[PDB]
C-alpha cells in the first residue's frame, strides 16, 4: 500500500544487527578464502553488496559451496576493509590501502567504492 | 579506524537487495507457518528485526529447523505486514489491521512497532 509509515533507522539497525551476528559467528554460512586468510560471512549479505557474490551465489552449483576461494592477486587487507564496509557502510580508506581497496572493489563489482577510490586518487594527482 | 568515510544509502540498498532475494526466493532458509499460511524468509533478517526470532535462531536445536510454527492466535495478515516491514522499513498500518499488527509485534518483540501502534490507538481515543 501507498499509505505506509517508515522507521528511518530500521535499515541501519538491521545492518548493525547483521554485523553483530557476524562478530559472534551466528549463522555464518560461507568462508571466503583470500590467500592465507579466511573470512566468515553470510552469503545473503555478500550478495546484497557485491555483483561478483550475487553471480556466485545465484549459480546452481556454487550456491551450495561453503568455501569460496578468491583470485590469489586479491589483497586480504583490501578484502577485509570491503567486508567491513558491507556490514557497516563505513570504508576505512587510507593512502596505504587505496590501491588494494580499489582493485578489490573492481573485482567484487562494488561500483560506489570504485567511484570514491577514483575520486580520492584523482585529488592527489 | 576512526578515519572511515560512509556511504549514506548503503544500509537501505542492502535491505532493498535482501527483499529482492526474498521476492525471488533466493537463499531463503526458513518457512514461518502462521495458521494456514506459509512465509519464506532468511533467518538472519528475522533475527536482526525480532527479539523472538533472535532467541529462536540462537537456540542450539531450533537454529537447525527449516520450519517454525507460530502460536495459532497470531494473525497471518499481521505477520505478513510485519515481515514486509522487516525487509523494507515500511509498515502498512491501517485502522482495520492495527490491533492485529500490534499483537503480532508484541509477540515478535518488535518494540518500535508496538510504540507507533500504541500512539496511533491513543490518538483515536
Amino acid at each position: 500500500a501507498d499509505s505506509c509509515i517508515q522507521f528511518t533507522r530500521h535499515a541501519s539497525d538491521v545492518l548493525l544487527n547483521l554485523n553483530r551476528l557476524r562478530s559472534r559467528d551466528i549463522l555464518t554460512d560461507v568462508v571466503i578464502v583470500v590467500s592465507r586468510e579466511q573470512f566468515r560471512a553470510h552469503k545473503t549479505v555478500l550478495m546484497a553488496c557485491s555483483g561478483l557474490f550475487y553471480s556466485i551465489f545465484t549459480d546452481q552449483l556454487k550456491c551450495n559451496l561453503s568455501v569460496i576461494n578468491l583470485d590469489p592477486e586479491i589483497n586480504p587487507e583490501g578484502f577485509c576493509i570491503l567486508l567491513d564496509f558491507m556490514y557497516t557502510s563505513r570504508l576505512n580508506l587510507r593512502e596505504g590501502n587505496i590501491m588494494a581497496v580499489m582493485a578489490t572493489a573492481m573485482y567484487l563489482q562494488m561500483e560506489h567504492v570504485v567511484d570514491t577510490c577514483r575520486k580520492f586518487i584523482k585529488a592527489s594527482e | 579506524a576512526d578515519s572511515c568515510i560512509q556511504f549514506t544509502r548503503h544500509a537501505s540498498d542492502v535491505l532493498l537487495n535482501l527483499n529482492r532475494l526474498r521476492s525471488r526466493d533466493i537463499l531463503t532458509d526458513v518457512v514461518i507457518v502462521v495458521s494456514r499460511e506459509q512465509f519464506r524468509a532468511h533467518k538472519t533478517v528475522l533475527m536482526a528485526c525480532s527479539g523472538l526470532f533472535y532467541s529462536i535462531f540462537t537456540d542450539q536445536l531450533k537454529c537447525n529447523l527449516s520450519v517454525i510454527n507460530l502460536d495459532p492466535e497470531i494473525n497471518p495478515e499481521g505477520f505478513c505486514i510485519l515481515l514486509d516491514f522487516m525487509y523494507t522499513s515500511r509498515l502498512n498500518l491501517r485502522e482495520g489491521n492495527i490491533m492485529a499488527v500490534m499483537a503480532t509485534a508484541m509477540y515478535l518483540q518488535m518494540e518500535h512497532v508496538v510504540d507507533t501502534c500504541r500512539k496511533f490507538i491513543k490518538a483515536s481515543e
Binding site: 509509515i5 522507521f7 533507522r9 | -
Partner: peptide, 5 residues
Amino acid sequence: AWVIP
C-alpha cells in the same frame, strides 16, 4: 523515529 516516506 517514524515518518511519511
